[PDB]
Amino acid sequence: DVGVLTLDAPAASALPHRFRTCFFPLTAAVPSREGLNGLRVSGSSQFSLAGLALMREQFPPRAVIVDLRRESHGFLGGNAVSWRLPDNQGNPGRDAAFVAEAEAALLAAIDERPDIVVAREARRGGPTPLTLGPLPAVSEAQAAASLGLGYLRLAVSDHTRPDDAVVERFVRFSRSLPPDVWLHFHSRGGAGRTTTFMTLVDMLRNAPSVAFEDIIARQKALGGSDLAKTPGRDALARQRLEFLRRFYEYARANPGGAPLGWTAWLAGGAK
Amino acid sequence: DVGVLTLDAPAASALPHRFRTCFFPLTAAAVPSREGLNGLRVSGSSQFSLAGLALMREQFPPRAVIVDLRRESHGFLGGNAVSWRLPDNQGNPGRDAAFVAEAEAALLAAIDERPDIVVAREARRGGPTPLTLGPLPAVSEAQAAASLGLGYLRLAVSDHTRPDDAVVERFVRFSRSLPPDVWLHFHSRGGAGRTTTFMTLVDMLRNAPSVAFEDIIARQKALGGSDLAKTPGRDALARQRLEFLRRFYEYARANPGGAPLGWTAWLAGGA
Amino acid sequence: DVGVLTLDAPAASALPHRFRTCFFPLTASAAVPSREGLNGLRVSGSSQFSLAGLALMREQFPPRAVIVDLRRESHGFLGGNAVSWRLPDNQGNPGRDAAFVAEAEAALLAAIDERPDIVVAREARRGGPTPLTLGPLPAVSEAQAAASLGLGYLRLAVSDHTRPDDAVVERFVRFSRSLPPDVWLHFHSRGGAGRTTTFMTLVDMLRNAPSVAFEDIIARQKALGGSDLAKAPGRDALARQRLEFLRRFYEYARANPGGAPLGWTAWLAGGAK
Amino acid sequence: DVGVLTLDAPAASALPHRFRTCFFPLTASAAVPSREGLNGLRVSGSSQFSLAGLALMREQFPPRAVIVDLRRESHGFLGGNAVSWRLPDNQGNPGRDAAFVAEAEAALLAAIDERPDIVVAREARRGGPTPLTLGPLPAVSEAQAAASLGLGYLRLAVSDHTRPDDAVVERFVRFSRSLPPDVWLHFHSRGGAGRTTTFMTLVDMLRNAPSVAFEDIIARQKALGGSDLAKAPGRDALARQRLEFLRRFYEYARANPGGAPLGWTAWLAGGA
Ligand SMILES: O=P(O)(O)O[C@H]1[C@H](OP(=O)(O)O)[C@@H](OP(=O)(O)O)[C@H](OP(=O)(O)O)[C@@H](OP(=O)(O)O)[C@H]1OP(=O)(O)O
Ligand SMILES: O=P(O)(O)O[C@H]1[C@H](OP(=O)(O)O)[C@@H](OP(=O)(O)O)[C@H](OP(=O)(O)O)[C@@H](OP(=O)(O)O)[C@H]1OP(=O)(O)O
Ligand SMILES: O=P(O)(O)O[C@H]1[C@H](OP(=O)(O)O)[C@@H](OP(=O)(O)O)[C@H](OP(=O)(O)O)[C@@H](OP(=O)(O)O)[C@H]1OP(=O)(O)O
Ligand SMILES: O=P(O)(O)O[C@H]1[C@H](OP(=O)(O)O)[C@@H](OP(=O)(O)O)[C@H](OP(=O)(O)O)[C@@H](OP(=O)(O)O)[C@H]1OP(=O)(O)O
């Protein structure tokens, strides 16, 4: 069971939903803004190919698309499509290396073939399905490269916090970035997963100087979701908020991911 | 048998060997035609260290892409570029980039942050005594490129060998999808056969209708590449490669820039 | 009379007031105007920035970005502080083009470069009314400030509270036509309102006038964070002259998409169609 | 006397003569000079370019690149053609700074903008001796040409065949110190030889003087494609004056790496 091939964003869509950068205005009470503008971070929902090209017009030099979707996905023509299991829990427990190979085979099987049936939710032009093809099927990694943009894949399950291995890899990644690299995160809807990692970036820089509640509140006011909003989905949201509180303390004791990493800090009892 | 872990370039290495751009001077033989060469938006080199990549980035234009042509599994252990070398460097034989990416990911994971990792060294790279390294971070080149805000494309080409038809097909489609501002930097292990082959393909896709086959081959050598016209096992592969380049030249003359027909579609029209 | 040396933005200021890009959200006043063609304009605007503010904006500027300075008045930077020479109604270098202004302000900046006891006036809104005494500090033009960051720079002398002269409109239309598809324009004036919003509107019209109503372009440039160009008799006369100009330029842009085939002066010479 | 309007580069010209970056190979004359610190200078140079030539060079320019125009003589573009106003020995705007030059050349360009029958002289090396008759064509400064491509622009008025004035050196050192680590400088003059190589050398010294010998820096800037700053009594005196200045700047850069803690003129005050 590889899931139902489903539409994420039609080829005709432009700027993806929930697009925002750390320079956007805050929509309210209003939390502290200290250290927000300088984070070199933005986020959005899943984009079409045209939407990516549009965003690139305002991307700075040396920008990176950080794909947070553990589920297999890609592009059929300009259409962003994905393979949806129940609760969108594709490739459960799999890392980005496994996911990349699995979704590559799925995309290869629909490349330049007619009569590809793509399901559509009501919010995305449904409920009637969309029949497409023959069209080129490509991964988002290649889509990003075709525009001269960096690409990093981190497998995060929908509605779920990132695994400890994903957090460790991202913190190490963040430390390695030259000062001029810009990160654009995205998930499917640009809400939970996207807002979580924009928050991690915010904490890695500002946790020593900005309150936990202000970071969570301002990432919402920027256009993200409310990570402080917390049975199945509620429990995952509670688990996520607990992780964010624990990561906040980590970032306070290890500004910018140093001197200790995430897993090393946990192994030492979070001293 | 996954091969011997071998050094490609030590962390201390700077600009990789055989680095050149389409703007470099031509070193003569008679000097070939230069029509259409400067405007190709292409460069090439041998395998680089992390420091070497960062140095090259200082002179990369906006929206630059690292095109990794190595079918063999490789990556970075610290700043050191390392690879798993089978006999004749024929790792992952017959495998595509999706298979290679996952296979090398596991290999890199097995040496990540571990002490006493023995890295073989050829005489030309400081050998025959090996290097004992660790604990050091092991990362794929995909992540190394992303950490600098650079694009990354992986195409699995066997050392000493032409690219498979499927690889050619994928690259021509990739080439057609590039906006006019995207820059491609190819590299292999030595920056000779495979690197020069693909710089030649880019040259032909733009200039085959107006520049002679022999001038393209000769000027890619004069830029700092290898001589693809120089052609028992290796000699047969070199002949196969040269014959392929002659066919692609014919394709590119009849289909400027890879249109209207693709590579495999064009092949179907043969006698 | 060269005017009073006045503070535009203190060195400690970060993101300049009224900063917005064509990707920013629209705040309605009235229904939200049409968004067709807005995101793709490759344009942003702001008020006068400090040096630190320019470096901050650069973090989000795309490659090949241009700082378009619309200030006819002489101005520059003393250290990180943005300063200018303000005549009554801020009408410095009246009727002068960018070439004249550049040389004039260059000498003014030279006279305060690395010298102590430079008295800079401050309006209440910019930390006043008490003055600011600075120095010794480096005095540089904005042209050099932009170059020091690898940013393009274009100077167009537009008077405060006033439309751009025909010669300025012609020069900008030609400039616009010459831009490769990847060049980004960031306009700024002193307050990032009238003059900045006028030129963001010109950019908007040059692309969208054939497909978007005049009122929608004016309203959405306001909703982006600019001023209301459709909103003190002498001041009102200039605003009326400006709106009349924008209506005439709209017709120009409808007949000559993107500034072609005819330029602004040629279109006017032909009797507007 | 504002000089003869002369062609620098025709519109059809592509990559300018003597184009090179600090990543280019070194051509030996003598042993190959030291390469330490050369690749990381973020610097390039060339002769005067046409508009098409600038667009071509931009294809390989990194982000945040700056065109540094070292020409004290008035010049600009008539269409795609690079043109200039040449006085005897190309000594236009003698003793004038960039602020004066920019306004003077702006008026000269305005006087030929969109006018027919503009006569542009041509030297033998540039298709002469017969002149070009052009127009109507748009006349723009190089400042605007760079801006139209999203490239930075800095003007430093240096006389042909001559070292930079102390005030120009002071301004450039201050400019260099103010650059973020990602800014790239592309110098150019008319021929990309004396003046261009001089400032590529100044950049080299500001970074590497403490660790690289004076003779290696001079020799490698030539081997990169520049001219020989160590190589007509009047011209010889200027070249000797220029080499002496380069020796003093080398000592300044050794004692003040990167232009700090002392500036150029402040350092000169400490002499005997
Ligand atoms: O893509 P959308 O139609 O906008 O749906 C989103 C998306 O969920 P899906 O992937 O199932 O579509 C969000 O998740 P991410 O892809 O950004 O990670 C999710 O966020 P949470 O998992 O945190 O709940 C969000 O839910 P919410 O609105 O509660 O933030 C939900 O939107 P809807 O609930 O409106 O469907
Ligand atoms: O990396 P190097 O030590 O510089 O060796 C290179 C490299 O071969 P290896 O990968 O085995 O090292 C070249 O291949 P690419 O990685 O660039 O594809 C190969 O080129 P060919 O495939 O055309 O043989 C070239 O050989 P040649 O000199 O014939 O160009 C060979 O150099 P050596 O013969 O000195 O080992
Ligand atoms: O700089 P500010 O303190 O923010 O004041 C601005 C600024 O006026 P000044 O240049 O005199 O400071 C605007 O002008 P620009 O520099 O952007 O061209 C002007 O716009 P107008 O010239 O069109 O009147 C605007 O006025 P408004 O908000 O009506 O657009 C006015 O703001 P205040 O009226 O609040 O002083
Ligand atoms: O443009 P070119 O025809 O190539 O001439 C150049 C140019 O002189 P002109 O400005 O008169 O043309 C050089 O000066 P720059 O513009 O680069 O500053 C000059 O260098 P010097 O000022 O050091 O004399 C150089 O002379 P040389 O090559 O001897 O260094 C000379 O080239 P030619 O000597 O071949 O005429």
Q: What is the 3-state secondary structure (H, E, C) of A159-195?
A: CCCCCHHHHHHHHHHHHHCCCCCEEEEECCCCCHHHH
Domain B4-258 has CATH 3.10.20.30: no
From the list A250, A268, A102, A98, the residue with the least C-alpha distance to A174 is: A250
Among candidates A134, A139, A161, A15, which has minimal Cα distance to A67? A139
Q: D49 CA distance to ligand 4 centroid (A)?
A: 15
B192 lines ligand 2 (CB under 6 A): yes
Q: Do residues A20 and A222 touch, judged by C-beta distance below 8 A?
A: yes
Q: Which positions 80-119 of D are in contact with A (Cβ < 8 Å)?
A: none
Instruction: Please list every residue in chain A whose beta carbon sits closer than 8 Å to the beta carbon of residue B177.
Output: 146
10 Å CB burial of residue C17 (0-12, 13-18, 19+) is middle
CA distance D63 to D57: 13
| Distance in angstroms (rounded) separating the CA atoms of residues B50 and B144 | 7
Q: Resolution of this PDB entry, in A? A: 2.0
Other CB atoms within a 10 A radius of the CB of residue C215 amount to 13
C104 contact partners, CB below 8 Å, separation of at least 6: C74, C93, C96
| Residue D70: C-alpha distances to residues D50, D102, D168 (Å) | 16, 12, 10
Among D60, D182, D183, D184, the strongest candidate for a mutation testing the A interface, having the largest count of A CBs within 10 A, is D182
Residues of D in contact with B22 (CB under 8 A): 60
Q: Which two tokens stand for residue A74?
A: 């890609």
Which of these, C48, C47, C39, C2, lies nearest to C21 by C-alpha position?
Answer: C39
* Four-way CATH pick for A4-267: 3.40.50.740, 3.40.718.10, 3.40.190.10, 3.90.190.10: 3.90.190.10
Tell me which H or E stretch contains A248.
Answer: helix A232-253
Are C63 and A61 inside 8 Å of each other by CB?
Answer: yes
Q: Is the CB of D200 under 6 A from ligand 4?
A: no
Q: 């605003």: which residue's tokens?
A: C239
Which residues share a beta bridge with B43? B21, B185
Please enumerate in sequence order all residues whose Cβ is within 8 A of that of C213, keeping only pairs 6 or more positions apart, or say none. Answer: C34
List of residues 6+ apart from D214 with CB closer than 8 A: D246, D247, D250
Q: Where are the alpha helices (DSSP H) in A39-78?
A: 49-56
Cβ-in-10-Å burial (0-12, 13-18, 19+) of C133 comes to: exposed
Q: How far apart are CA D80 and CA D50, in angstroms?
A: 6
Q: Hey, is D22 helix, strand or coil? A: coil
- What CA–CA distance (Å, rounded) separates D101 from D121? 21
A19: contact with C, CB 8 A cutoff: yes
Which two structure tokens, joined as six digits, stand for D257?
A: 């790496």
Q: Choose the closest CB to C24 out of A24, A60, A61.
A: A24
Number of helices followed by number of strands (H, E) in chain C: 8, 11
Amino acid letter, D241:
Q
Question: Per the CB < 8 Å rule, is A181 touching B98?
Answer: no
Whether D266 and chain C come into contact, CB under 8 Å, resolves to: no
| Cross-chain Cβ contact A147/B179 below 8 Å | yes
Using most ligand atoms within 8 A of CB, pick from A158, A199, A238 the residue to mutate for ligand 1: A158
Cα of C22 from ligand 3 centre, angstroms: 21
Q: Which residue of C has its CA nearest to A60?
A: C62
**Cα B189 to middle of ligand 2, angstroms:** 7
Domains of chain D: which residue ranges?
13-72+141-268
Which of B102, B137, B177 is nearest residue A100 as measured by Cβ atoms?
Answer: B102
Which ligand is in closest contact with the Cα of C160? Answer: 3
Determine the distance separating the centroid of ligand 3 and the alpha carbon of A140, expressed in angstroms: 45
CATH number of D13-72+141-268: 3.90.190.10
Q: What is the token pair recorded at A24?
A: 């956007």
Using CA positions, which residue lies closest to atom 15 of ligand 3? C191
Kind of pairing between the strands at C152-158 and C65-71:
parallel
Ligand 1 atom closest to the Cα of residue A124 is 3
The token duo for D46 is 């060339």
Query: What residues does D44 pair with on adjacent strands?
Result: D21, D186
Residue D129 preceded by cis peptide, ω within 30? yes
Residues of C in contact with A37 (CB under 8 A): 14-15, 56
Which residue among C56, C58, C62 sits closest to A57, beta carbon to beta carbon? C62
Q: Would you call C182 an interface residue with chain D, using a CB distance cutoff of 8 Å?
A: yes
From the CA of B9, which ligand is nearest? Answer: 2
| Cβ-based neighbours of D153, under 8 Å, separated by 6 or more | C143, C147, C152, C153, D66, D67, D69, D142, D143, D146, D147
Atom 10 (ligand 4) nearest CA: D190
What φ, ψ does residue D77 adopt, rounded to 5°? -130, 135
Q: C127 among the known binding-site residues? A: no
Q: How far is Cα C188 from Cα C194, in angstroms, rounded to an integer?
A: 10
Interface test with B, best of A95, A176, A177, A260 (most B CBs within 10 A): A176
Q: Running DSSP on this structure, what letter comes out for residue D212?
A: S
Question: Helix, strand or coil for residue A75?
Answer: strand
Atom of ligand 2 nearest to the CA of B188: 16
Task: State which of A225, A227, A234, A240 you would mutate to test the pocket of ligand 1, scoring each by most atoms of that ligand within 8 A of its C-beta.
Answer: A225
Please tell me the experimental approach by which this structure was elucidated: X-ray
CATH numeric code, C4-269: 3.90.190.10
With a CB-CB cutoff of 8 Å, which residues 129-168 of chain B face chain A? 137, 142-143, 145-153
Q: Residue count of chain B, please give it.
A: 271
C194 CB less than 6 Å from ligand 3?
A: yes
Secondary structure element (H or E) that encloses residue D181, with its range:
none
The answer to whether A125 is a known ligand-binding residue is no
Report CB contact under 8 Å: B62, A182. Answer: no
Minimal CA–CA distance to A181: which of A200, A165, A201?
A: A201
Query: How many A from CA of B193 to the centre of ligand 2?
Result: 6
Q: Which ligand 1 atom sits nearest the alpha carbon of residue A193?
A: 18
